[PDB]
Amino acid sequence: AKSAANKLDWAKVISSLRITGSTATQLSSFKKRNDEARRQLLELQSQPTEVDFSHYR
Amino acid sequence: FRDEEGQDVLLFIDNIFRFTQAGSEVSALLGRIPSAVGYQPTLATDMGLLQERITTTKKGSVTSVQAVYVPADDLTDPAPATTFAHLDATTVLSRGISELGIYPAVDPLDSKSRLLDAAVVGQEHYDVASKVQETLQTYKSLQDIIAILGMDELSEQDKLTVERARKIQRFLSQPFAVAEVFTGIPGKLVRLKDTVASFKAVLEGKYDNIPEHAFYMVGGIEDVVAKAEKLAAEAN
Amino acid sequence: STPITGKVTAVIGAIVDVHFEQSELPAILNALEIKTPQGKLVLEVAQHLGENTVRTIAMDGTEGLVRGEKVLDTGGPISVPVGRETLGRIINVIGEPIDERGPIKSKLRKPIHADPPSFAEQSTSAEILETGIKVVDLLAPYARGGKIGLFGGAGVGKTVFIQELINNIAKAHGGFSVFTGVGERTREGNDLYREMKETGVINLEGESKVALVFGQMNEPPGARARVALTGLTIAEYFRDEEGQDVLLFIDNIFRFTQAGSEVSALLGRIPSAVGYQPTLATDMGLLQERITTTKKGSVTSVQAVYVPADDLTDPAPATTFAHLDATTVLSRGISELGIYPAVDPLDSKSRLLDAAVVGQEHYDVASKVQETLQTYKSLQDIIAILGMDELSEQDKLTVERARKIQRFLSQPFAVAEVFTGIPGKLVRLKDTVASFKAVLEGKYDNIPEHAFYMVGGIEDVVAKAEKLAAEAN
Amino acid sequence: QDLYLRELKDTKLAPSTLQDAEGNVKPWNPPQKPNLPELELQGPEALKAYTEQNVETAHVAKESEEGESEPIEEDWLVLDDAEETKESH
Amino acid sequence: WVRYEASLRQLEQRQLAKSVISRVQSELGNPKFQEKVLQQSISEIEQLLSK
Amino acid sequence: KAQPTEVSSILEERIKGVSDEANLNETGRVLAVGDGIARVFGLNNIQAEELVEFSSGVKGMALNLEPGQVGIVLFGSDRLVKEGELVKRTGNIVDVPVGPGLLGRVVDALGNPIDGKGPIDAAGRSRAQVKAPGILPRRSVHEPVQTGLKAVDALVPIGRGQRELIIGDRQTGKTAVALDTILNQKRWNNGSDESKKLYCVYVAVGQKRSTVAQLVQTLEQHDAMKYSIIVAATASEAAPLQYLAPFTAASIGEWFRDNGKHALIVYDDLSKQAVAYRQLSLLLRRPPGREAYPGDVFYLHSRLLERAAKLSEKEGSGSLTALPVIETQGGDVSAYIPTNVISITDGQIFLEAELFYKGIRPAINVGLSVSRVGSAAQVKALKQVAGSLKLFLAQYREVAAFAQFGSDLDASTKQTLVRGERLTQLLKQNQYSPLATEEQVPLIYAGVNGHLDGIELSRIGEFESSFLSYLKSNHNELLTEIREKGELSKELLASLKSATESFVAT
Amino acid sequence: TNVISITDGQIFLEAELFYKGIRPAINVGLSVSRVGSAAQVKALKQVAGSLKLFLAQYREVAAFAQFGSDLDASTKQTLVRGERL
Ligand SMILES: Nc1ncnc2c1ncn2[C@@H]1O[C@H](COP(=O)(O)OP(=O)(O)O)[C@@H](O)[C@H]1O
Ligand SMILES: Nc1ncnc2c1ncn2[C@@H]1O[C@H](COP(=O)(O)OP(=O)(O)O)[C@@H](O)[C@H]1O
Ligand SMILES: [Mg+2]
Ligand SMILES: [Mg+2]
Incomplete structure (x- = not known):
């Protein structure tokens, strides 16, 4: 579902060779990238957030 | 097979050196004083007893191919060094040439055979092989002078000889059909006459302009020309 | 009780054969006593030869031993006094005090032969031991609970290196330290004992937080072999029963292997490679595995390996490399050019050189230092043959920078002021990593390489450069 | 088997007061009733952070801040800054 | 808590090993050198009855 | 209780x-x-x-x-x-407990538990000395062993049943690359397909107990101890134990191999086993051979290693992969034990301190590191796909043959030198960072197109991480396509080229 | 090697220095003392404290004599001092 959003974002980036000199658009890009990377890292590393009282207790 | 059946035999023994290794292995516990390099005292004896029974008699012929493993890449080890005298055609595979990318790894200098005679392979074949050998020898004598000082200091004739010998060394590599696992290029069957013609053409300087890469991992001189053309096409 | 009397049958150099009667055979490594006129001689049962004959190794000189002399079995292996009583005392292999300060009033005497603590280990190899030596604080960090090798051949400077290690660490360490002096110079031991006495490290009428073991190379092979074991007994008793972090100190761990080969030559064993004892690996592992962190307490080891004939491939130095968390290889070639200590920057190595423990900054600085030094060594051949001109600008800059770092690796030691002539410097880890980071960026390229010679931090480099540029020039 | 039964009840009675019966511990003088159940019960808490981790202190997530409701100054400043850089594309 | 309980099991095994010395000393002073000899003799007799 | x-x-x-x-x-x-x-x-x-x-x-x-x-x-x-x-x-005859219960446990040479985790549950007892499978029961190595490091996978691939020797000098990354191979298997061992699960057996013969504790805790942290097996032969332990422990671990791995499972046994050290057996012979009154080594160190190594093989489908299609080590003395590859073991193993992995300090973090010496099965035992997406990935090794050998010492002939020579330098820059991989094939393939492809215009060599380290992140974002379809299918289609190659161009543009 | 490992210092004597003309030879750099430095005569220590530095400086400078040039004034002074030394 996220593929369309960043696909169009980098399509705008490919169009953005002419609006060069911007300050925080690229900064906001790395901000989104860092936030989504932290998303997928926390979702991958997240073990089942419950104590297995049947066995692990 | 040779004597009773009266048929030509190809006795392929892979790494015959294991026989002498096992002989030296059991010799220590057999109450035998070890020989040099910790080998059995009888190494020449039992090894020759094995090797002589491999021969062509009046009843049949045995075209045996025996691989020999040299310990520590040392060609002076007693087992292979003594095995050399028991062998008609010799093909030495040194690690150094293999390290340069030549996958057949056959060092062209010590790879010598008794058949290399003008009365056997022909005068032109002997001349081409001898010219190749002197080119590689001149290259090898110029290892250190090029490595530590530079190819620029050599004379124009010496530079030409060095580059021709580089081309030859690349041309020695040949695609083996069973070696597609490593090369990734289909194996080629270069004929004897084709090889002689290609190498006499290269020695004559006919293809000095062709880059050294085009001789890498190829078959005949036609394959060299095709690879050079492909390289020029992709380089643009 | 009933004494176990044995008769001497063979005296082969340092090895004595003892014959007993039926069912009185001492086990392997038991201690046997003979009442020699000069005192008592202790024999350790090395092998059972059969027919109720035991092959033993002498703890002292075998002169004056007559075949058939009575041999008394102590009932167990050699027992060395242990506890805080032994702190500040000098003890030989046997266990009797040799400091002429009266007998040691130790409550217990643990045997010198003990099993390793097995899998009671901890993976606590993450605490950097700040020694003050900038090269080891950067290239090969030392572990508080690990083992330090400190390799080197003749000369090189291994003894001053270890002495500097005590001077920087044991003065302000939270625990006790043990020095064994395995097959070294007796004058060196006397000087180093006096040095601790002056610093207050060993206070005769005081705490005296350090126990000393000796029996230097003037002693027979059996001594040089078992002095490491008795020092290990001291260290293990302090480590387990006292629960204290112990600073082991072995001045030459190689001498144990040398003595083992010496006795094996007379033990009827076919020699191993380079004529060593076949069990060299086995005894070496048994020795080193008594030096472990263990659940209770911790040990720092700190070895000093002598490479025979400056051969790093010698079987004993090759074997000890495995049993060492960090090593400090001192190369004689570096010693020739004068960079002291003569530690090889790209042969020391340490398991602690990982970003998780180091911090990814000091690790990167060390990696780039190794980069420059490896490139320098690779280019030495053409530098000698051709010169610096043939190299491109990048290679020339790299060679000059690597020369600067290699000069900077030299550090004055407080125990070597008589040799350097310059007061010793103790460089903190953060100081040296910052200094070498600044050097790597090229901030001090204009400064001559000689300003890095016998200096401490980068501030000392700047000071020396200014002095050379103004007062000298 | 005399070699068996006597060693068996010896190995049963020696820890009987230790484990089966509540007779403290006879083989060694130091008490065990107030030591492993009581003194070592906080052993995992002693090695770890007592009253800091075993309680699993739950910090409520801090509310994520934003533009702080600035619909005029922020937009105008962004437009002006983009105008400054648009003349030098 | 899991490896604390594991260490507790290790410690109780170690304390049983410590009490093993008292167990051994119990039979050391026990005049056991007569009943044990008879039992091992009759065990040997039973062993050789099959053979 | x-x-x-x-x-x-x-x-x-x-x-x-x-x-x-x-x-x-x-x-x-x-x-x-x-x-x-x-x-x-x-x-x-x-x-x-x-x-x-x-x-x-x-x-x-x-x-x-x-x-x-x-x-x-x-x-x-x-x-x-x-x-x-x-x-x-x-x-x-001496035997060792074998079975699936050995997983998650550390045992000595004899198989007795030394980790203090209770008794060992063994499905059976297998002889420590077991004859290797014959010519017919084996099968050609085709299933790759995913090591997770770029250089070794690309240049010297290891397959199921292959015997690849990690030959090197002291502390040159031998046990380190062994550990990355060990850890990379967690991707498949956490799944359900037993045909892709690869159970691990470590042989700690001659290593010190502190190193073994480091090992077991490291495996514990990266969820790897559950499928790995630690056979520790401490140096303090008797020399016969060091001699026998690799054989018992070989039997343990043969248990998995004969039951249709794939086992990776890393014969780490094994030079300590060699010297321990030398001690055994030299006190057993056996006269020695060369440099006081006994006669059957070659026979010992060969007999131990040959037990590792890829069984045929008739034998359950199981495999047993060997990763032996040789600790060379001063880079002496041309020594008795090194060349002996190299003649046994199906290729060797050479590591020297020269490349270790030169920057190559895997320290993969592409020259003397050769694998006996290049095309086979490799991921299809990584073997040849675009052709250059196949003669990758030949290109590296050329780069070595015309390195900076050779005269920079022309623009073609400059391009070749740049390509080689960027490629060896790429191959460096941080420790304990197993990089999967679905992520290896895009990087190797980027080393052929878009490699030359890299902004400084030092920045390729962060360029690799950024390229991984780029492939993760709205390109995970390509990653899972190359992970699942195995082969690369023409449209897949075009998509990868487009992604590489888009990234190198940024 | 082992003898150096026992003794308290070494006095190396170059063969080329013997052949070059330096009759006592003695490599001033390789030769080194451990415990005689504290035992050295105090006046001799005062007059020879910097002698080691000058000889080391010559040992470094003599590797610069190939490119006979100005060589900077300091190196020339060190050479013209250490040769007389
Ligand atoms: N910090 C230092 N400063 C100057 N010289 C040193 C230093 N440390 C060691 N040395 C040198 O070490 C050499 C011999 O040292 P030592 O280790 O005692 O010999 P060995 O290793 O044979 O026992 C001497 O020549 C001395 O100059
Ligand atoms: N990615 C890496 N690959 C190899 N070695 C590394 C890596 N990162 C760090 N190292 C360092 O290199 C050393 C590897 O040596 P090791 O594999 O332990 O050899 P040995 O076990 O023979 O001593 C380790 O001590 C480690 O600190
Ligand atoms: Mg010394
Ligand atoms: Mg290792």
Whole structure:
């Protein structure tokens, strides 16, 4: 579902060779990238957030 | 097979050196004083007893191919060094040439055979092989002078000889059909006459302009020309 | 009780054969006593030869031993006094005090032969031991609970290196330290004992937080072999029963292997490679595995390996490399050019050189230092043959920078002021990593390489450069 | 088997007061009733952070801040800054 | 808590090993050198009855 | 604690039953016990290399059976054993417990648990000395072993049943690359497909106990101890234990191999096993061969390694992958033990300090590191796909042959030098960072197109991480496509080229 | 190697220095003392404290004599001092 959003974002980036000199658009890009990377890292590393009282207790 | 059946035999023994290794292995516990390099005292004896029974008699012929493993890449080890005298055609595979990318790894200098005679392979074949050998020898004598000082200091004739010998060394590599696992290029069957013609053409300087890469991992001189053309096409 | 009397049958150099009667055979490594006129001689049962004959190794000189002399079995292996009583005392292999300060009033005497603590280990190899030596604080960090090798051949400077290690660490360490002096110079031991006495490290009428073991190379092979074991007994008793972090100190761990080969030559064993004892690996592992962190307490080891004939491939130095968390290889070639200590920057190595423990900054600085030094060594051949001109600008800059770092690796030691002539410097880890980071960026390229010679931090480099540029020039 | 039964009840009675019966511990003088159940019960808490981790202190997530409701100054400043850089594309 | 309980099991095994010395000393002073000899003799007799 | 009680009762009842029916008469009596070995008279019916039990409790094993006396190597210290002590022959050749319960446990040479985690649950007992599979039962190595490091996977791939030697100098990354190979298997071992699961067996022969603790904790952290097996032969442990531990671990791996499972056994060190066996021979009165090494160090290494093979479908299609090590002395590849083991293993992985300090973090010496199965035992997406990935090794050899020492001939030579430098820059991989093939393939492809215009060599380290992140974002379809299908289609190659161009543009 | 490992210092004597003309030879750099430095005569220590530095400086400078040039004034002074030394 996220593929369309960043696909169009980098399509705008490919169009953005002419609006060069911007300050925080690229900064906001790395901000989104860092936030989504932290998303997928926390979702991958997240073990089942419950104590297995049947066995692990 | 040779004597009773009266048929030509190809006795392929892979790494015959294991026989002498096992002989030296059991010799220590057999109450035998070890020989040099910790080998059995009888190494020449039992090894020759094995090797002589491999021969062509009046009843049949045995075209045996025996691989020999040299310990520590040392060609002076007693087992292979003594095995050399028991062998008609010799093909030495040194690690150094293999390290340069030549996958057949056959060092062209010590790879010598008794058949290399003008009365056997022909005068032109002997001349081409001898010219190749002197080119590689001149290259090898110029290892250190090029490595530590530079190819620029050599004379124009010496530079030409060095580059021709580089081309030859690349041309020695040949695609083996069973070696597609490593090369990734289909194996080629270069004929004897084709090889002689290609190498006499290269020695004559006919293809000095062709880059050294085009001789890498190829078959005949036609394959060299095709690879050079492909390289020029992709380089643009 | 009933004494176990044995008769001497063979005296082969340092090895004595003892014959007993039926069912009185001492086990392997038991201690046997003979009442020699000069005192008592202790024999350790090395092998059972059969027919109720035991092959033993002498703890002292075998002169004056007559075949058939009575041999008394102590009932167990050699027992060395242990506890805080032994702190500040000098003890030989046997266990009797040799400091002429009266007998040691130790409550217990643990045997010198003990099993390793097995899998009671901890993976606590993450605490950097700040020694003050900038090269080891950067290239090969030392572990508080690990083992330090400190390799080197003749000369090189291994003894001053270890002495500097005590001077920087044991003065302000939270625990006790043990020095064994395995097959070294007796004058060196006397000087180093006096040095601790002056610093207050060993206070005769005081705490005296350090126990000393000796029996230097003037002693027979059996001594040089078992002095490491008795020092290990001291260290293990302090480590387990006292629960204290112990600073082991072995001045030459190689001498144990040398003595083992010496006795094996007379033990009827076919020699191993380079004529060593076949069990060299086995005894070496048994020795080193008594030096472990263990659940209770911790040990720092700190070895000093002598490479025979400056051969790093010698079987004993090759074997000890495995049993060492960090090593400090001192190369004689570096010693020739004068960079002291003569530690090889790209042969020391340490398991602690990982970003998780180091911090990814000091690790990167060390990696780039190794980069420059490896490139320098690779280019030495053409530098000698051709010169610096043939190299491109990048290679020339790299060679000059690597020369600067290699000069900077030299550090004055407080125990070597008589040799350097310059007061010793103790460089903190953060100081040296910052200094070498600044050097790597090229901030001090204009400064001559000689300003890095016998200096401490980068501030000392700047000071020396200014002095050379103004007062000298 | 005399070699068996006597060693068996010896190995049963020696820890009987230790484990089966509540007779403290006879083989060694130091008490065990107030030591492993009581003194070592906080052993995992002693090695770890007592009253800091075993309680699993739950910090409520801090509310994520934003533009702080600035619909005029922020937009105008962004437009002006983009105008400054648009003349030098 | 899991490896604390594991260490507790290790410690109780170690304390049983410590009490093993008292167990051994119990039979050391026990005049056991007569009943044990008879039992091992009759065990040997039973062993050789099959053979 | 009823468990110690009933286990003690059962063991003592078994002892009573053994005493009731023993009739041991030809049992031996020790004549002369040396340094960890004893010569014993008697045992007229002893089998060769049969386990024995000394009266002191130390176990033994019979290498040389001289007339009258037999040499017993002790699996422990010689403290307890004395002259005239009774020795009890176990009646069976030395074996090691094997099965799936060994997973998650650390055991000694004999297989006894040393991690203090309880008794070992074994599906059976397999001989420590087991004949290697014959010519027919094996199968050609085709299934790759995903090591997770770029250089070794691209240049010297390891497959199921292959024997690849990690030959190198001291502390040059041998056990490190062994560890990355060990850890990379967590991707498949956490799944359900047993045909892709690859159980691990580490052989810590000659390593110190602190190193083994480091190892076991490192495997514990990265969820790897559950599928790995640690056979530790401590240097302090008796030399016969060091000699035997790799054989017992080989039997343990053969258990997985014969049951349709794939096992990776890393014969780490094995030079310590070599010297331990040298000690065994040199106190067993066996005259040595070269440099005081006994005659059958070659036979020993070959017989031990040949047990690792890829079984055929008729034999369950199982595999047993060997990763032996050689600790060379000063980079001496041309030494007896090194070249001996190289002649056994299906290729070698060379590591020297030269490349280690030169920057190459895997320290992969592409020259002397060769794999005997290049096209096979490799991921299809990584083998040739675009052709250049196949002659990758030949290109590296060319780059070595015309490195900076060679004269920069022309623009083609400059481009070749830049390509080689960027490629060796790419191959560096941080420790404990197994990089999967679905992520390896885009990076290797980027080393052929878009590699030359890299902004400084040092920045390729962060460029690799950024390219991984780029492939993760709205390109995970490509990653899973190359992970699942295995081969790369023409449209897939075009998409990868487009992604590489888009990234290099940024 | 082992003898150096025992003794308290070494006095190396170059063969080329013997052949070059330096009759006592003695490599001033390789030769080194451990415990005689504290035992050295105090006046001799005062007058020879910097002698080691000058000889080391010559040992470094003599590797610069190939490119006979100005060589900077300091190196020329060190050479013209250490040769007389
Ligand atoms: N910090 C230092 N400063 C100057 N010289 C040193 C230093 N440390 C060691 N040395 C040198 O070490 C050499 C011999 O040292 P030592 O280690 O005692 O010999 P060995 O290793 O044979 O026992 C001497 O020549 C001395 O100059
Ligand atoms: N990615 C890496 N690959 C190899 N070695 C690394 C890596 N990162 C760090 N190292 C360092 O290199 C050393 C590797 O040596 P190691 O594999 O332990 O050899 P040995 O076990 O023979 O001593 C380690 O001590 C480690 O600190
Ligand atoms: Mg010394
Ligand atoms: Mg390793």
